[PDB]
Structures are given as structure tokens and as C-alpha cells.
Design a protein around this ligand. Structure first.
Ligand SMILES: NC(=O)C1=CN([C@@H]2O[C@H](COP(=O)(O)OP(=O)(O)OC[C@H]3O[C@@H](n4cnc5c(N)ncnc54)[C@H](OP(=O)(O)O)[C@@H]3O)[C@@H](O)[C@H]2O)C=CC1
Ligand SMILES: NC(=O)C1=CN([C@@H]2O[C@H](COP(=O)(O)OP(=O)(O)OC[C@H]3O[C@@H](n4cnc5c(N)ncnc54)[C@H](OP(=O)(O)O)[C@@H]3O)[C@@H](O)[C@H]2O)C=CC1
Ligand SMILES: CCc1nc(N)nc(N)c1C#CCc1cc(OC)c(OC)c(OC)c1
Ligand SMILES: CCc1nc(N)nc(N)c1C#CCc1cc(OC)c(OC)c(OC)c1
Lengths: 165, 165
């Protein structure tokens, strides 16, 4: 019914942790640069909580914020209130990026075609998690080691998966 | 259609720069040693402009120069004029190395199975670039930090990717 590619863009740790105290648990600017490169020119779909922590519209991409608040407005951003409204807004898009956080990852989980997932080899203290996924009918199409140096203090890998059927 | 493994051998910077003023933009003897080690005993496929800058046949390898010049000859070197002519000359080879530069990298890009790519963590002035690549269905099978010392003044990593399908 929807015809834009639904992609998940996420970074998580050994226990699926993605967030702590309404923020990121880790500082990895190189991972952020990979994120910016991959998502450039494509809509970003983010939950209200995810967006507000970010604070600003992210440049070179349609910023779409998901909230139940029927009177929510932010300048230079579009607002959706459901999965379907997002699909309407993105009717003609090539590929959209579900950008988090957990509640929004849950929301769109039945619709994911492609998963860009960064795996961090460390056990962080956290309160927000990426939901479990049945990977049957999923094929790993890409994997590479992330940059570990003095500015990026963890070991991590970029993985990309595509759904077969 | 062809049966030899087609490998790319390339060193590039943060912006895909591979050349400046028909030469290399950096001096990195250690990276040269890695190159000589990995390519030894295998054919080198070089664009005419790449070859002439080098100046001499490289020992222990078949040197194959790619040119449109139907009357071009160099002693101790073989001359091809097309992708297919290279494939003919290399029909029995296990693995051939596409050695550059840009025009020759473009030429063979549809056929690459393996990528040996050094990434240099510096932004050089340059005029020649390694083409963009869709890494879908490629997996990184090797990564290691290059030697940084007084004789090799940059930060760089050796990467190897293999095509899955
Ligand atoms: N490391 C990573 O890859 C990522 C981590 N994060 C982290 O995750 C955390 C944020 O995630 P989380 O707390 O789950 O919050 P979310 O980003 O998922 O936002 C939650 C909000 O989304 C809206 N919402 C949820 N469901 C619906 C629905 N069905 N219909 C309409 N609107 C809905 C609600 O907005 P409202 O209340 O206004 O109605 C809700 O409060 C932070 O810690 C953040 O840093 C976020 C993205 C990526
Ligand atoms: N850092 C690295 O990994 C590498 C960098 N380099 C750098 O790259 C630069 C050179 O690259 P570039 O300028 O692209 O030159 P090339 O090495 O690609 O040589 C170009 C020549 O190849 C021949 N050629 C191109 N297309 C075809 C074709 N379709 N059929 C037959 N022959 C063809 C032509 O020769 P003709 O004119 O005779 O007809 C053309 O002039 C230099 O600066 C060099 O130092 C080179 C290799 C590796
Ligand atoms: C951890 C990164 C990240 N990586 C990947 N692979 N996917 C994602 N979806 C996100 C994400 C996210 C949320 C996010 C992004 C940000 O920069 C744009 C933030 O600003 C610094 C931010 O501050 C609170 C929060
Ligand atoms: C930068 C090295 C290099 N590294 C990698 N990883 N791949 C490559 N394909 C090349 C290359 C190249 C071209 C090249 C080679 C040379 O020595 C053999 C050169 O002599 C000093 C040279 O001078 C004009 C030019």
C-alpha cells in the first residue's frame, strides 16, 4: 500500500540500549557523520521526544515529527500524528528513515524493509531499548568496522539488512 | 562471462582524492610496501596516464597498459585497448589488480569483485577522484591501521571488501 522504502536508522549496544535519561548514552562523532551521510536528502521520521532532545531541524532532510498532540507545531518541520499520515506525507518519497526513538521504532516495526543498525560492543547503563526483531527473511547486505580512535572510544560495526519477503 | 577475480587496488583520502597534477598527493612508503606485497605475482592493469607517471615496468608482475592508441608500445609491458582485450589477455589469471587511475577505475567498475582500499585521514588538494560505489552486497573482510611514524606522516587504514552478489 505504501511504496516508499521504510528504513530504520539506529545505533544500539550489546543489550539493545539506545538511550539514557532522554539522551544518547555515548558520544561517537564518527557514527554521527555516517548517519548524516546515509540520511542526507531523505525524510527523517522522529518521535516527539526524540526530536525535542535534538532541538533543531536537521538540514538537507524533511524533518517529520510524530506526536498525538493535534496542536503541535515547530518551524521548519512537518508534523504527523499516525503511521498513515506519515505515509501520506511521504507518498512520493524514494526512501524514508525511521530515526527513533523506541516508541516510534515500535510504531513502524511492522513496515520496515531495510535496517541500518550500528552495533556498539559495550554494555551501557540505559532505560530505552531497540525492540527485538525476527530476522528470518532478512539478509545482511553490508558490514564494516567503525572508526575507533581517541575521539571515538568504543568498538562498533555498521550493519545493513534487507528484508527478502 | 570472465573467470579471473577482478580486484581494485587504491589509496584515497577523506574526499576520495587519489591524484594531484598527474601525480600522487602524498608520500607514504609503508603503504607502497603493502601495495607491492599484495599485488606481487599478479597482473597490474594501469591507465596510460597512470603508467607514464610511474615510468618503468613494475617487477614481478605483468604490466598491462590501457590506451586507445592503436600503435602504442612499451618494452616489457603488454598493451590493451579495451576491457575485453584485458579479459582476453587475463583469461587464465587467478586475480588481476586494477591499479588506476580514475578513468581506468571507472572503466572496470561494473566488474569489480574485491576492493583493496586504503583510506587516508587527511583532506588533500587534488584533481583526480576515486568514483562513488554502492556497497550494497559488499562485506568488509579486513581492516587494520597503517604505520604512522616519522617516515609516514598521516593516519590511514587498510580496508578490504568482497562482493557477495
Ligand atoms: N541511539 C539511537 O539510534 C537513538 C536513540 N534515541 C533515544 O531514545 C530516547 C527517545 O525515545 P522514546 O523515549 O521512546 O521517545 P520517542 O522518540 O519514541 O517519542 C515518544 C513520543 O512519540 C509520540 N508517539 C508515540 N506513539 C505515538 C503514536 N502511536 N501516535 C502518535 N504519536 C506517538 C508521543 O508524542 P506525544 O507525547 O507528543 O504525544 C510520544 O511521547 C532518547 O533517549 C533518545 O536519545 C532516539 C533515536 C535514536
Ligand atoms: N592513489 C591511487 O590509488 C592512484 C592514483 N593515481 C593517480 O591518478 C591520476 C591518473 O589518473 P587519470 O588521469 O584518470 O588517468 P588514467 O590512469 O586513468 O589514464 C587515462 C588514460 O587511459 C586510457 N583510457 C581511458 N579510458 C579508456 C578506454 N575506455 N579504452 C581504452 N583506453 C582508455 C586513455 O589513454 P590514451 O590517452 O593513451 O588513449 C586515457 O588517457 C594521477 O594523478 C595518478 O597519480 C593513479 C593510480 C592510483
Ligand atoms: C546515536 C546516533 C544515531 N545513530 C544511528 N545510527 N541512528 C540514529 N537514529 C541515531 C540517532 C539519534 C538521536 C539524536 C541524534 C542527534 O544528532 C543528529 C543528536 O544530537 C547530537 C541527539 O541529541 C540528543 C540525538
Ligand atoms: C598511492 C599508492 C597506491 N596505493 C594503493 N593502495 N593503490 C594504488 N593503486 C596506488 C597507486 C598508484 C600509482 C603510482 C604508483 C607508484 O608506485 C608503485 C608510483 O611511484 C612512486 C607512482 O608515482 C606516480 C604512482
Amino acid at each position: 500500500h505504501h511504496h516508499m522504502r521504510v528504513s530504520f536508522m539506529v545505533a544500539m549496544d550489546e543489550n539493545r540500549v539506545i538511550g539514557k535519561d532522554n539522551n544518547l548514552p555515548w558520544r561517537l562523532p564518527s557514527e554521527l557523520q555516517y548517519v548524516k551521510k546515509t540520511t542526507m536528502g531523505h525524510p527523517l521520521i522522529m518521535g516527539r521526544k526524540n526530536y525535542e532532545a535534538i532541538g533543531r531541524p536537521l538540514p538537507g532532510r524533511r524533518n517529520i515529527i510524530v506526536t498525538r498532540n493535534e496542536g503541535y507545531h515547530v518551524e521548519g518541520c512537518e508534523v504527523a500524528h499516525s503511521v498513515e499520515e506519515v505515509f501520506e506525507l511521504c507518498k512520493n518519497e524514494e526512501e524514508i528513515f525511521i530515526f527513533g526513538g523506541a516508541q516510534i521504532f515500535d510504531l513502524f516495526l511492522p513496515y520496515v524493509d531495510k535496517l541500518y543498525i550500528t552495533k556498539i560492543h559495550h554494555a551501557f547503563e540505559g532505560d530505552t531499548f531497540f525492540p527485538e526483531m525476527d530476522m528470518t527473511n532478512w539478509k545482511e547486505v553490508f558490514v564494516e568496522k567503525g572508526l575507533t580512535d581517541e575521539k571515538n572510544p568504543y568498538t562498533y560495526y555498521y550493519h545493513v539488512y534487507e528484508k527478502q519477503q
